[PDB]
Design an enzyme around this catalytic site. Sequence first.
Site, PDB file in Angstrom:
ATOM      1  N   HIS A  29       0.856  -1.215   0.000  1.00 12.48           N
ATOM      2  CA  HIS A  29       0.000   0.000   0.000  1.00 12.48           C
ATOM      3  C   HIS A  29       0.875   1.243   0.000  1.00 12.48           C
ATOM      4  O   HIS A  29       0.789   2.042   0.907  1.00 12.48           O
ATOM      5  CB  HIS A  29      -0.920   0.001   1.196  1.00 12.48           C
ATOM      6  CG  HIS A  29      -1.926  -1.080   1.112  1.00 12.48           C
ATOM      7  ND1 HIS A  29      -1.784  -2.251   1.808  1.00 12.48           N
ATOM      8  CD2 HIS A  29      -3.088  -1.159   0.420  1.00 12.48           C
ATOM      9  CE1 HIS A  29      -2.822  -3.025   1.550  1.00 12.48           C
ATOM     10  NE2 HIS A  29      -3.641  -2.370   0.715  1.00 12.48           N
ATOM     11  N   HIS A  62       1.705   1.834  -5.588  1.00 13.20           N
ATOM     12  CA  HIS A  62       0.322   1.322  -5.750  1.00 13.20           C
ATOM     13  C   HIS A  62      -0.604   2.491  -6.072  1.00 13.20           C
ATOM     14  O   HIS A  62      -1.422   2.366  -6.959  1.00 13.20           O
ATOM     15  CB  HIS A  62      -0.116   0.558  -4.513  1.00 13.20           C
ATOM     16  CG  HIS A  62      -1.580   0.297  -4.426  1.00 13.20           C
ATOM     17  ND1 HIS A  62      -2.159  -0.754  -5.043  1.00 13.20           N
ATOM     18  CD2 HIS A  62      -2.558   0.875  -3.693  1.00 13.20           C
ATOM     19  CE1 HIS A  62      -3.444  -0.802  -4.714  1.00 13.20           C
ATOM     20  NE2 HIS A  62      -3.711   0.203  -3.920  1.00 13.20           N
ATOM     21  N   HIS A 114      -5.993   7.294  -2.847  1.00 12.88           N
ATOM     22  CA  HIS A 114      -7.028   6.393  -2.247  1.00 12.88           C
ATOM     23  C   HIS A 114      -6.500   5.603  -1.028  1.00 12.88           C
ATOM     24  O   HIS A 114      -7.322   5.091  -0.248  1.00 12.88           O
ATOM     25  CB  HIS A 114      -7.630   5.458  -3.309  1.00 12.88           C
ATOM     26  CG  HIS A 114      -6.820   4.233  -3.557  1.00 12.88           C
ATOM     27  ND1 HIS A 114      -5.647   4.256  -4.259  1.00 12.88           N
ATOM     28  CD2 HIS A 114      -7.013   2.949  -3.205  1.00 12.88           C
ATOM     29  CE1 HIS A 114      -5.111   3.043  -4.231  1.00 12.88           C
ATOM     30  NE2 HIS A 114      -5.925   2.234  -3.612  1.00 12.88           N
ATOM     31  N   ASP A 115      -5.189   5.444  -0.869  1.00  8.77           N
ATOM     32  CA  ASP A 115      -4.614   4.664   0.256  1.00  8.77           C
ATOM     33  C   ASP A 115      -3.694   5.566   1.081  1.00  8.77           C
ATOM     34  O   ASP A 115      -2.794   5.055   1.762  1.00  8.77           O
ATOM     35  CB  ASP A 115      -3.863   3.444  -0.257  1.00  8.77           C
ATOM     36  CG  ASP A 115      -4.758   2.233  -0.439  1.00  8.77           C
ATOM     37  OD1 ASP A 115      -5.582   1.950   0.454  1.00  8.77           O
ATOM     38  OD2 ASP A 115      -4.621   1.573  -1.479  1.00  8.77           O
ATOM     39  N   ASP A 175      -8.378  -0.536  -8.057  1.00 16.89           N
ATOM     40  CA  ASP A 175      -7.696  -0.965  -6.812  1.00 16.89           C
ATOM     41  C   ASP A 175      -7.186  -2.394  -6.945  1.00 16.89           C
ATOM     42  O   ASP A 175      -6.114  -2.691  -6.341  1.00 16.89           O
ATOM     43  CB  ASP A 175      -8.593  -0.896  -5.587  1.00 16.89           C
ATOM     44  CG  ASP A 175      -7.823  -0.739  -4.291  1.00 16.89           C
ATOM     45  OD1 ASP A 175      -6.595  -0.492  -4.348  1.00 16.89           O
ATOM     46  OD2 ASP A 175      -8.455  -0.886  -3.232  1.00 16.89           O
ATOM     47  N   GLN A 186      -5.458 -17.684  -3.523  1.00 18.61           N
ATOM     48  CA  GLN A 186      -5.544 -16.836  -4.738  1.00 18.61           C
ATOM     49  C   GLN A 186      -6.783 -17.299  -5.507  1.00 18.61           C
ATOM     50  O   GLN A 186      -7.596 -16.430  -5.897  1.00 18.61           O
ATOM     51  CB  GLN A 186      -4.261 -16.884  -5.562  1.00 18.61           C
ATOM     52  CG  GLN A 186      -3.163 -15.998  -4.997  1.00 18.61           C
ATOM     53  CD  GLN A 186      -3.731 -14.660  -4.608  1.00 18.61           C
ATOM     54  OE1 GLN A 186      -4.127 -13.863  -5.440  1.00 18.61           O
ATOM     55  NE2 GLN A 186      -3.871 -14.455  -3.321  1.00 18.61           N
TER      56      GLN A 186
HETATM   57  O1  LIG Z   1      -5.165 -12.076  -2.337  1.00 19.87           O
HETATM   58  C1  LIG Z   1      -6.084 -11.502  -1.788  1.00 19.87           C
HETATM   59  N1  LIG Z   1      -7.006 -12.216  -1.030  1.00 19.87           N
HETATM   60  C2  LIG Z   1      -7.054 -13.721  -0.827  1.00 19.87           C
HETATM   61  C3  LIG Z   1      -8.268 -14.237   0.056  1.00 19.87           C
HETATM   62  C4  LIG Z   1      -7.883 -15.606   0.680  1.00 19.87           C
HETATM   63  N2  LIG Z   1      -6.449 -15.581   0.533  1.00 19.87           N
HETATM   64  C5  LIG Z   1      -5.687 -16.559   1.125  1.00 19.87           C
HETATM   65  C6  LIG Z   1      -6.307 -17.477   1.972  1.00 19.87           C
HETATM   66  C7  LIG Z   1      -5.454 -18.402   2.611  1.00 19.87           C
HETATM   67  C8  LIG Z   1      -4.066 -18.404   2.394  1.00 19.87           C
HETATM   68  C9  LIG Z   1      -3.541 -17.430   1.551  1.00 19.87           C
HETATM   69  N3  LIG Z   1      -4.356 -16.555   0.947  1.00 19.87           N
HETATM   70  C10 LIG Z   1      -5.844 -14.415  -0.176  1.00 19.87           C
HETATM   71  C11 LIG Z   1      -6.158 -10.009  -1.941  1.00 19.87           C
HETATM   72  N4  LIG Z   1      -6.812  -9.273  -1.031  1.00 19.87           N
HETATM   73  C12 LIG Z   1      -6.927  -7.931  -1.091  1.00 19.87           C
HETATM   74  C13 LIG Z   1      -7.761  -7.350   0.037  1.00 19.87           C
HETATM   75  C14 LIG Z   1      -8.748  -8.413   0.598  1.00 19.87           C
HETATM   76  C15 LIG Z   1      -7.595  -7.877   1.461  1.00 19.87           C
HETATM   77  C16 LIG Z   1      -6.366  -7.155  -2.127  1.00 19.87           C
HETATM   78  C17 LIG Z   1      -5.664  -7.875  -3.117  1.00 19.87           C
HETATM   79  C18 LIG Z   1      -5.547  -9.302  -3.024  1.00 19.87           C
HETATM   80  N5  LIG Z   1      -4.864 -10.076  -3.957  1.00 19.87           N
HETATM   81  C19 LIG Z   1      -3.843  -9.651  -4.796  1.00 19.87           C
HETATM   82  C20 LIG Z   1      -3.398  -8.343  -4.735  1.00 19.87           C
HETATM   83  N6  LIG Z   1      -2.390  -8.025  -5.561  1.00 19.87           N
HETATM   84  C21 LIG Z   1      -1.847  -8.883  -6.423  1.00 19.87           C
HETATM   85  N7  LIG Z   1      -2.227 -10.149  -6.505  1.00 19.87           N
HETATM   86  C22 LIG Z   1      -3.227 -10.552  -5.709  1.00 19.87           C
HETATM   87 MG   LIG Z   2      -7.307   0.953   0.685  1.00 22.38          MG
HETATM   88 ZN   LIG Z   3      -5.504   0.354  -2.689  1.00 24.10          ZN
END
Ligand SMILES: O=C(N[C@@H]1CCN(c2ccccn2)C1)c1nc(C2CC2)ccc1Nc1cncnc1
Ligand SMILES: [Mg+2]
Ligand SMILES: [Zn+2]
Length: 313
Positions: A68, A72, A106-107, A217, A269
């Site tokens: 963040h 970003h 935004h962050d 975002d 993921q």
């Molecule tokens: O990855 C995200 N959430 C998942 C939800 C279950 N999970 C698990 C669950 C168990 C173990 C390991 N991970 C990870 C994720 N979350 C958020 C916000 C919601 C906070 C923003 C971006 C995200 N992804 C991402 C960002 N930038 C590049 N690439 C990807």
């Molecule tokens: Mg934010």
């Molecule tokens: Zn953000």
Amino acid sequence: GLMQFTLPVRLCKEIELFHFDIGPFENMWPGIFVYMVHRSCGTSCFELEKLCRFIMSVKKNYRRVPYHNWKHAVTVAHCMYAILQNNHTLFTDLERKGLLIACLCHDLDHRGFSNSYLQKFDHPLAALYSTSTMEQHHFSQTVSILQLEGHNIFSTLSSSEYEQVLEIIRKAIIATDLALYFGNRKQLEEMYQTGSLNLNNQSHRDRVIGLMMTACDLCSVTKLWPVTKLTANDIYAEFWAEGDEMKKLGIQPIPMMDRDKKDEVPQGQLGFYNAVAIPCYTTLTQILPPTEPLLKACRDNLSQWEKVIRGEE
Ligand SMILES: O=C(N[C@@H]1CCN(c2ccccn2)C1)c1nc(C2CC2)ccc1Nc1cncnc1
Ligand SMILES: [Mg+2]
Ligand SMILES: [Zn+2]
């Protein structure tokens, strides 16, 4: 006025693409952002002396956290630029002005922790704003920088034009609270499927600008796989920090935030693309069809996570 910013050929050409990566050189990002304000808005929208001083105050109030960060901020501003260019005529002159600032802001002053860890830690910001804790802090932080002597990029707007633009920005910034994404998308799906959806309905635009902000975002999942994969490292550096903090408050954190449970990443993921990213960009392409490339890239990255699990990379 008669100053343009002109990027190198490769940037000049790559920046128009949804998947553009703004590169490892911190000291061009401010210029990439101006480049996008002039091409998106006009070399007129802001006075360059004001804009620059706003940018460097915004850069300064982001923190050196893994994800963040300033990088970003500008990543998310470019995704909005991409959306704004390929839908030239759907958006008002004020909305193009507001939304790019919104995205950059935004962050603002994030510390690497979820609204959840603030409440379990009983941080003061959780006493001041019961929900969208950080997102109300980020908007407050934006109002603050605009009010520094010499930083009011919006000073050459009527009293009314001004109030509209801070209200676009406010809602834009609140919408990047993923907890208000779910309801907002269900409503928008229902509204385009049942045909009621009306872009002259101000309250319906609001929802649509909200979707864009979630799309922008989340835009790290829409990048080429090497980019998405290396961004994932930074995102889990924060999540695991937060997990460690949760553990010091004597609270087993969710698996997403537990660094012992690295093995569960690919499947985490998976749910995230299915439960949030695909629906986001699906609904967004349905409503703004030139945003299709984000759905196609997101899809492609899902398939790349399917391949990690299958034990093939
Ligand atoms: O990855 C995200 N959430 C998942 C939800 C279950 N999970 C698990 C669950 C168990 C173990 C390991 N991970 C990870 C994720 N979350 C958020 C916000 C919601 C906070 C923003 C971006 C995200 N992804 C991402 C960002 N930038 C590049 N690439 C990807
Ligand atoms: Mg934010
Ligand atoms: Zn953000």
